[PDB]
From a paper:
In both crystals and solution, ngNAGS is consistently hexameric, while mmNAGS/K and xcNAGS/K, as determined herein, are tetrameric. Each mmNAGS/K subunit has two domains, the AAK domain (residues 1–290) and the NAT domain (residues 292–441) connected by a hinge residue, Gly291.
In the native structure, this CoA molecule was visible, as well as a second molecule in the cleft between subunits A and X. This CoA binding site does not correspond to the CoA binding site in ngNAGS and other GNAT enzymes and is unlikely to be functional, since most of the residues forming the binding site are not conserved and there is no glutamate binding site close by. In the native mmNAGS/K structure, there is residual electron density in subunits A and Y at this site that can be modeled as L-glutamate suggesting that this site is likely to be the biologically relevant L-glutamate binding site. Interestingly, in native mmNAGS/K, glutamate can only be identified in subunit Y and A. The structural variation between equivalent subunits in the native protein and Se-Met substituted mutant is much lower than between subunits within a tetramer. The RMSD between equivalent subunits is 0.4–0.5 Å for subunits A, B, and X, and 0.8 Å for subunit Y.
Author numbering:
A (entry chain X): 5 to 439
B (entry chain A): 5 to 440
The structure:
Amino acid sequence: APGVRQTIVQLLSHMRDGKEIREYLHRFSGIDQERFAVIKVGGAVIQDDLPGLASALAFLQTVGLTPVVVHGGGPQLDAALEAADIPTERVDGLRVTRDEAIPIIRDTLTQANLALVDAIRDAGGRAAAVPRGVFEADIVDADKLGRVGEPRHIHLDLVGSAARAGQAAILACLGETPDGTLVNINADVAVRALVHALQPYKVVFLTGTGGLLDEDGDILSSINLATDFGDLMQADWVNGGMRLKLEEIKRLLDDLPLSSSVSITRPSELARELFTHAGSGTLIRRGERIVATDDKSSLDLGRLDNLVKAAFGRPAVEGYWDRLRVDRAFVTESYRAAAITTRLDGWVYLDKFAVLDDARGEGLGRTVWNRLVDYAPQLIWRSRTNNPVNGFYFEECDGAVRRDEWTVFWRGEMGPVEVADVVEKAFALPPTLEA
Amino acid sequence: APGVRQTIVQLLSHMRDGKEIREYLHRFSGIDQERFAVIKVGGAVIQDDLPGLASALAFLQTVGLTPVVVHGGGPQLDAALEAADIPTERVDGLRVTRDEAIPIIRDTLTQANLALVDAIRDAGGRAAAVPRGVFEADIVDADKLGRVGEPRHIHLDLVGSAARAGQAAILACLGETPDGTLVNINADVAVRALVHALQPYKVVFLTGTGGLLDEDGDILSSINLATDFGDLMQADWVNGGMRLKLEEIKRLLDDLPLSSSVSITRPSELARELFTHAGSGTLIRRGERIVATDDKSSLDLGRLDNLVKAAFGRPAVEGYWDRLRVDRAFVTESYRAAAITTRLDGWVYLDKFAVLDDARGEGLGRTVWNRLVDYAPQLIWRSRTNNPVNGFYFEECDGAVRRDEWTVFWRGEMGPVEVADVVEKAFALPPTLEAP
Ligand SMILES: CC(C)(COP(=O)(O)OP(=O)(O)OC[C@H]1O[C@@H](n2cnc3c(N)ncnc32)[C@H](O)[C@@H]1OP(=O)(O)O)[C@@H](O)C(=O)NCCC(=O)NCCS
Ligand SMILES: N[C@@H](CCC(=O)O)C(=O)O
């Protein structure tokens, strides 16, 4: 109680991710009991890597947060104890469970549950076993699915306790009925119900794969449901399986504020993912729409003049804006990330790419970038040999010429000797921000 | 002890620099508690920045790491030494300090000691006051230099005590003859004797400037005495002071094991310095030497084939090694890092750069590489897209062209036409290594 809370202040204040951590914590003080963070976790995780999952969640709690873990039984019961005590598995719609199957489920869930609760503590944490008592559900089928039910009220009583106790709540997917009868609850429906009730600021999905994947099989860093979602469903390259993950994640995020955001990762990266503007693994949000224009008189110059001053660290120089010509402006509804292109001897030129810290974190920088380079297949830009955005530029560039102070990039398909003459012109261009 | 450990690690394991801090712990878990560091503090730094000082020294103490911090009063001591008076004389090259200076010196350092010890604790740490009882010296010269001495034997019992208890041992520079006589001790001669006695993994020199400087006047991230010490000592931009500093830093490091490393940095930087590849100071190793040669014959190509199978995921194609026509090669004395340069339509072109993780971190990747780009001012290379070292490449290139699979870099002033030419060539060169 004494030594912990304190000896991480005067600890992670000498660490490198340290200031950036203290700051989510503080601002993530939309405490309200357990409004902290709901976390679904695959059954094939509690199995194939417990000590990690358990170290992961222990860190959260000893750092400040109060996770509300929910868990399934996949491998451990979809296999083992049913192909074993020989009741077999009956899949109608998707998964029924006659009377004989119940004591197997009850048995196994309270096992993994406890497995996890104890593991966390083993790993430095404080946790609380909540195997039954939260999910009150009706049995909707009877003659069909046998003994499966739907969450008709959430009981936070027991969760509430753990929260004030400094413990993580570890909840299994069993629910009584209004008459006290046991029944199974697939975790998809059960995370909806819980996440509505609590209204959390964060929603993690801990999977073995620990991510969600772009067109090129790489990890999909960030999704803007507002802009990116449409194309995403109606997209040949996104499988049916993932399409659901989406149809079902929007369903979640639409039930929460815009403060809210879901994160899919694997435990070993979960922390580096909740506390870095980088991240690791897919982060999703309702996000904002982007307005795209070429009519300057259609732009909050003063608001933008703020966006720039804030992003760069210095003020644009006098009457810079009134002069500015403007080929195309892409600005996010909130004005927290913009790109403005002028022209240069007939090349699309990136005059300002300005994005704010928290805007980078919601993955909007990326979102503005995309629409820009979906506009300008040939694009020239410069940057200071300092601006730490250079590395993001270098992976988007196709060309790059370095000098002591400036660095010109291109993203067209022209060649070293074709750009040659326009590359020189960007270097020649004068600073439009001060010292 | 394995109680603290277990958990204080189960935290870092999730911190960006968690891995390197975890390692230091494990290394220095028992019996070597006092073998981790010999932190020397400028008398000037206990003056202005005492709080920040304590807060670093404190942050170490609070993760497992128990320093042996040594100090020497400096300025506050000269000011006080002129108060009473009789302050001057340097007959030799060290000061002369006579009987009258003593009572002041001892009570001046003693106070500085306490000051610091109590400071570390306020900061949150745990420390020990060792104002005297560690430095047993003989007395250099009677008449000439007064009551100055030279350390002969180090009595480490008081520091094992501290270290053993999880406490940073704060040692002040005060001597004591074998006939009991108390005596003045020069900090440098005193730190050398202690680093001997202890054989630390580290020897940190804390200052205000917090780093050594290059010809440019920027900071000198590192040094590789095996290679860099000759060059540095003939250079006309390396003044006296800095020569004399490197000299001493060498005498220490020749006396420690290989793993040892001297850092000179600033209190605010100590963490970054000791737990990031980069740090915020000048870091010095004894290091290993590099050979340069036009003479493929004169190389262990069997080793090299490994160095390159181990760096890259896979090994060179069949016959790559026979075939190869070396322009120049720089291989490190241990074949943990090598640049191999061939020729391409005239230009020097970089056919192999391979640096193992362990070597990349010790700072050899750069040592080979400076040696390369020094030989080949105009250089053309290439790298795959998914290559770890592309960022360092891009920091070092003068321009670069990127295609999906590969990327061609270059250095040196080089006309557009000159460059597009050679570039389309290096894109053409076929895989000298096997595929993924
Ligand atoms: C650009 C250049 C390198 C040549 O290649 P190119 O024919 O123009 O084609 P590009 O290099 O532009 O195409 C490469 C890019 O397309 C992109 N791309 C392709 N598929 C993609 C995908 N699924 N997702 C995202 N980006 C994708 C990339 O962003 C990539 O570069 P990257 O490595 O930074 O990611 C050029 O500077 C050049 O050398 N031109 C001169 C031509 C010549 O023959 N010169 C000789 C004498 S005149
Ligand atoms: N990336 C390596 C060589 C890879 C290859 O050409 O096969 C280098 O340039 O040093």
